[PDB]
Amino acid sequence: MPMQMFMQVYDEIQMFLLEELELKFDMDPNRVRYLRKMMDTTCLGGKYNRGLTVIDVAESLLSLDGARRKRVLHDACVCGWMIEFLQAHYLVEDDIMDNSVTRRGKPCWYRHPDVTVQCAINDGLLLKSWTHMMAMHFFADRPFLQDLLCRFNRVDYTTAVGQLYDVTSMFDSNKLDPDVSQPTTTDFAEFTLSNYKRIVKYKTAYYTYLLPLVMGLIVSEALPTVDMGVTEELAMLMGEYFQVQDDVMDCFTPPERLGKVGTDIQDAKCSWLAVTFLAKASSAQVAEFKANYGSGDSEKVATVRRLYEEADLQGDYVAYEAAVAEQVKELIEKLRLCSPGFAASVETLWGKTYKRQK
Amino acid sequence: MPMQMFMQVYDEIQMFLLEELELKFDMDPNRVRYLRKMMDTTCLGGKYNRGLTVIDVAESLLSLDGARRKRVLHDACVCGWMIEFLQAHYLVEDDIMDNSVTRRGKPCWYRHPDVTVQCAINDGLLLKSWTHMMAMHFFADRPFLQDLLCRFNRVDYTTAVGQLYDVTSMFDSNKLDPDVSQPTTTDFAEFTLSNYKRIVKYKTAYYTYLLPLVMGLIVSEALPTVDMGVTEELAMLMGEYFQVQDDVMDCFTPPERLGKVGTDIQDAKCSWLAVTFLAKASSAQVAEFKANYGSGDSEKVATVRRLYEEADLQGDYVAYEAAVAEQVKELIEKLRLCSPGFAASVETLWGKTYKRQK
Ligand SMILES: O=P(O)(O)C(O)(C[n+]1cccc(F)c1)P(=O)(O)O
Ligand SMILES: O=P(O)(O)C(O)(C[n+]1cccc(F)c1)P(=O)(O)O
Ligand SMILES: [Mg+2]
Ligand SMILES: [Mg+2]
Ligand SMILES: [Mg+2]
Ligand SMILES: [Mg+2]
Ligand SMILES: [Mg+2]
Ligand SMILES: [Mg+2]
């Protein structure tokens, strides 16, 4: 049911956008077709957990003829897509920024045969503009419009900030200067857990966990009924854990099931495995690491992979995962004391995160 | 005076943004410094014609206690930067897409020594987010906020759509197909004045001419008082002429004066010169053009340039300019009948456009 309704609204959104382009932007059939393909390829294919959560959080707060339910649930699907389209935008640019080859089993958007990298960058921009176009089209008369968009934009902004932290993590920040070049850090002094948590919090936690919950509460007109301090704590913790899983899979999950080929080591990324490894590594391990990380060379990539394996990072992950699970639990219980319906929707989201396989 | 207050609000905006990142986003001194230079380099240096126009329309509508003048002009300055920051965002991305080397007399942002292309793409995104961040910070209580941002976003969108038309103009659209590679057109059957006008109208006209006048009308609470049909007519006319000038300057203006090195011929762009030349050229002239256009080779490039001068595009430009000057004149009078103060500001705006040199 959730997915069926969500997809019906997707076509409704697509039709509005595509036809408006034809009618008011003087767009030809060829480019409309291109944009329809671009939209489907960049927005469809995932598990839609960010978008579906909005619908689930909205439906579950429906208690605080059917008219209302129909409006609230449809507003929820629109918001769900706003987030899915926002993500799509970031993913298109991110793939370019991370030099990835595939995503969701297919080539990254900018690696498609008839898609130039220069056009891909702009298509990414179109994806984000669409979030605002659909928002105005469906919510122009809603009282929550301003607060809704004010929050959406702040999260958009925090994600861009996190991406800044992500792409500048392997460069000595003390030497960060637009006018003078510098190579990848060679002492990796900044690959610390503190720095890692900051990167992940802003680039993933906010738009992946907090925004779906907040938008769900807003279209449900129940925002004030929840402890926001606890909700944010929960979103931040679940968000970090999700990126950790993302980092681990990048290195150890086969691309067949992952749907995307990892580039974290190649890109010398400040991943969870890298910081956790470096924090426990002996002097010998650190030396060998430094001499193999950040290279495309296949053997040096398998050597970094072996190190992690030898330093029992898989064991470290299990420990961490268990510590997260207990905090989430104590936090959801705190939520439940005043927001039983909301806390249950949160449990569901957790169920889609805990030990996810993809 | 207009230029002194405009820069004053710039410091007020930079301060708010950078300090918020430190306080609320946990940003370090090194990255805050990096972003300060990013903001200065990408947002300062131009003519500020877009931003200054808002201030001038605003001031010229004040008549049709003294604190109101203060408030209205300050809101006008903020709106000016929203546009200037919007443009900064598109220019950062555009330079990467156009593979440009310099802008405003220095390396394009993605060309700065310690600015990687990957971070440059994201820095572009930050610039856009800041337009919304500053707008929320200054206009949170204004009744015009929704309407202001609704128009702003619409124009942001038209630019992106125009950029799509610009970057896919050298590829036979009938074969535009994400999954299939294709080379730059060889028949150039699509390099038509018809297609050229669409590109320019959307990538330049809206954000360069309409938006300034529109935001000016809004902060002075006078949008209703004007004939929008005539207003859009003017903005589109001046906008197209503005881009034609940008196209001509790209090929004939010395980089020392222009501030950037032309890339249109090399990028095989659907420029005013290209379409104009092709529409009047003999079969021999078209052949030569086809064997020299869209090549980095300075000699072939030199040939395209010679083809243009010999076809006397210099003369068509002058005839075009005079026809544009004529129309603008007539529309400005039609505007003057019921909106004299606004028509005056539009006159001033045209005066910064007609035969500009830069
Ligand atoms: O699975 P990936 O590699 O696409 C990723 O999770 C995408 N991504 C995640 C968060 C924000 C973003 F803009 C983009 P990563 O961060 O590049 O590892
Ligand atoms: O002088 P340039 O080359 O920076 C240009 O006018 C910029 N520009 C103009 C309009 C929209 C845009 F996104 C970017 P062009 O169009 O690339 O020739
Ligand atoms: Mg990334
Ligand atoms: Mg990535
Ligand atoms: Mg990843
Ligand atoms: Mg350009
Ligand atoms: Mg361009
Ligand atoms: Mg140009």
Side-chain angles (χ1 to χ4, degrees), chain A residues 20 25 114 122 160 177-178 180, chain B residues 114 122 154 160 165 177-178 180:
Chain A
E20 168 177 55
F25 292 68
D114 204 293
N122 190 61
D177 187 351
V180 187
Chain B
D114 236 355
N122 194 66
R154 271 246 149 210
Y165 291 146
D177 180 326
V180 192

Side-chain angles (χ1 to χ4, degrees), chain A residues 23-36:
Chain A
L23 282 346
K24 296 153 68 173
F25 292 68
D26 190 25
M27 190 166 292
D28 53 285
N30 283 138
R31 289 182 175 67
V32 170
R33 179 178 317 125
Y34 175 98
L35 254 18
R36 174 172 55 69

Side-chain angles (χ1 to χ4, degrees), chain A residues 90 94 98 103 163 166 203-204 207 243 246 260 264:
Chain A
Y90 271 115
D94 177 76
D98 298 339
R103 176 177 299 277
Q163 284 297 86
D166 174 288
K203 79 166 182 178
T204 293
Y207 97 86
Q243 193 53 51
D246 181 53
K260 64 195 185 189
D264 279 351

Side-chain angles (χ1 to χ4, degrees), chain A residues 166-209:
Chain A
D166 174 288
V167 297
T168 62
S169 70
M170 65 301 282
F171 297 100
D172 182 314
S173 68
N174 298 148
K175 295 175 174 174
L176 227 197
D177 187 351
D179 298 318
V180 187
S181 46
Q182 209 63 285
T184 306
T185 186
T186 43
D187 75 348
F188 291 113
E190 300 192 288
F191 274 46
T192 66
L193 194 44
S194 304
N195 287 164
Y196 177 70
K197 291 162 69 68
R198 177 178 68 170
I199 297 168
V200 171
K201 172 174 182 178
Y202 292 101
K203 79 166 182 178
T204 293
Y206 277 99
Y207 97 86
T208 305
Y209 286 79

Side-chain angles (χ1 to χ4, degrees), chain B residues 94 98 163 166 203 269:
Chain B
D94 180 76
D98 294 344
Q163 283 289 276
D166 166 286
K203 78 169 182 176
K269 288 298 160 64

Side-chain angles (χ1 to χ4, degrees), chain B residues 229-257:
Chain B
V230 173
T231 303
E232 299 198 332
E233 250 203 287
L234 261 155
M236 303 296 106
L237 177 63
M238 289 186 280
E240 175 187 290
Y241 164 74
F242 181 84
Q243 191 57 216
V244 165
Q245 293 176 302
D246 182 64
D247 286 352
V248 170
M249 291 180 285
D250 197 80
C251 178
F252 301 116
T253 307
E256 288 57 45
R257 307 185 46 229

Side-chain angles (χ1 to χ4, degrees), chain B residues 62-282:
Chain B
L62 291 180
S63 61
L64 180 63
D65 69 315
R68 182 168 183 293
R69 191 227 183 63
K70 261 58 181 294
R71 191 194 83 240
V72 177
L73 285 184
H74 184 96
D75 293 343
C77 284
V78 183
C79 287
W81 285 116
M82 279 177 72
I83 307 183
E84 290 292 322
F85 270 61
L86 179 59
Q87 164 167 273
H89 159 259
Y90 273 108
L91 297 189
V92 166
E93 312 294 357
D94 180 76
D95 284 336
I96 292 167
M97 291 156 67
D98 294 344
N99 192 49
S100 291
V101 180
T102 59
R103 176 174 300 280
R104 290 160 188 173
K106 18 182 177 172
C108 293
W109 186 243
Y110 79 108
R111 291 274 176 170
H112 285 234
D114 236 355
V115 174
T116 56
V117 180
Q118 59 267 201
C119 185
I121 298 176
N122 194 66
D123 290 332
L125 305 181
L126 287 170
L127 288 166
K128 175 178 272 186
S129 283
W130 288 338
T131 63
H132 294 96
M133 296 304 98
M134 75 180 84
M136 190 57 48
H137 176 258
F138 291 106
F139 308 150
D141 304 312
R142 303 276 196 285
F144 62 62
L145 185 49
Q146 190 198 314
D147 181 53
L148 205 216
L149 293 184
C150 180
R151 294 170 186 286
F152 184 72
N153 288 162
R154 271 246 149 210
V155 176
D156 174 19
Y157 183 42
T158 59
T159 304
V161 171
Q163 283 289 276
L164 162 71
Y165 291 146
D166 166 286
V167 103
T168 57
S169 73
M170 347 76 184
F171 299 104
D172 173 13
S173 58
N174 302 76
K175 300 181 183 171
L176 223 196
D177 180 326
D179 293 312
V180 192
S181 180
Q182 289 296 336
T184 298
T185 191
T186 53
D187 70 342
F188 290 97
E190 292 193 292
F191 269 50
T192 63
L193 188 65
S194 185
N195 287 164
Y196 176 74
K197 292 169 130 296
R198 177 177 60 170
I199 296 170
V200 161
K201 178 179 174 179
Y202 292 99
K203 78 169 182 176
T204 297
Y206 282 109
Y207 97 83
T208 306
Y209 285 84
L210 212 238
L211 184 56
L213 304 179
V214 161
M215 293 186 101
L217 291 174
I218 288 171
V219 298
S220 59
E221 309 163 294
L223 183 147
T225 80
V226 304
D227 181 300
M228 200 48 76
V230 173
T231 303
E232 299 198 332
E233 250 203 287
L234 261 155
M236 303 296 106
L237 177 63
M238 289 186 280
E240 175 187 290
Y241 164 74
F242 181 84
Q243 191 57 216
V244 165
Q245 293 176 302
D246 182 64
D247 286 352
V248 170
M249 291 180 285
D250 197 80
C251 178
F252 301 116
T253 307
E256 288 57 45
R257 307 185 46 229
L258 195 54
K260 59 209 196 65
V261 186
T263 51
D264 289 343
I265 293 162
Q266 300 96 324
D267 297 351
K269 288 298 160 64
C270 188
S271 68
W272 181 75
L273 299 171
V275 303
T276 304
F277 173 79
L278 293 181
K280 70 190 296 183
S282 68

Side-chain angles (χ1 to χ4, degrees), chain B residues 6-20:
Chain B
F6 188 58
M7 285 314 293
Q8 169 168 43
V9 182
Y10 177 76
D11 301 316
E12 167 164 33
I13 294 175
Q14 189 169 76
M15 191 167 294
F16 160 67
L17 294 172
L18 296 184
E19 301 199 321
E20 174 179 53

